[PDB]
């Protein structure tokens, strides 16, 4: 549901599941061109240090 | 053929077209001579005539020979088909089923109870036109364009699996590869994890081409 989700698993994990598509990766590789997602990193489980829950 | 079973004794035996296959028939107490040893005079018998030969038994004749009625009739019924009723009481005196009979006598079957205007003489080019709807169906899975040797021999996929997937604009691996779960899931054949598995074998095919 969060874009958080999609950069805590890598772009590599999701290419070999088939329910992404052709044009889905196209339109991934758009979105991580703005490199703000799918920048391959590993996250606690959601939060930062940032996201702190207060 | 019965001499290149000597020194024995042979009886009968069965034929065909280039490979005939003398299918030798003789009985289990003559056979024991008859084939004598399993590797020795099957061989020395083979190249009698030249081709090969495929001693069997009396009774295996028979049991063959039934396997063979019931198949021009043993395949779904793939003919000409009309009321069933009435195609039992034809199949009962119908020698060797209906299965391209309309090239041998198109007269006896007017003797049977029954025959007013060609009709009968119809119903067996029902079955020629059967032949012509078999190669309909051979259209559906070539006259129409079926798909090719890389999404033939993919593993995991069979040729029915291979025609429903190819029958939606499909032609390659890589066509195959390009589809989506949701786009396979419109045939019913296929389904979900199915088409995910196939659609995934064919992008990994297709990625991991360069290695062997």
Redesign the interface.
Known sequence: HYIGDLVQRTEVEL?????L??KSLTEIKDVLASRGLSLGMRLENWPPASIADE | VINAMAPADVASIVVDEDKHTMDIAVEAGNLAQAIGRNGQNVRLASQLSGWELNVMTVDDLQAKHQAEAHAAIDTFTKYLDIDEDFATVLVEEGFSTLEELAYVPMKELLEIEGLDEPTVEALRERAKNALATIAQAQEESLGDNKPADDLLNLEGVDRDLAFKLAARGVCTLEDL??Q??DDLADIEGLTDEK???L??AA?NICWFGDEA
Do not use: Q, S
Request: glycine share 18%; charged share 25%.
């Open positions: 290419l070999k599941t088939p329910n598509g052709k | 590869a390009e989506g779960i088409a995910g598995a659609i995934m992008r």
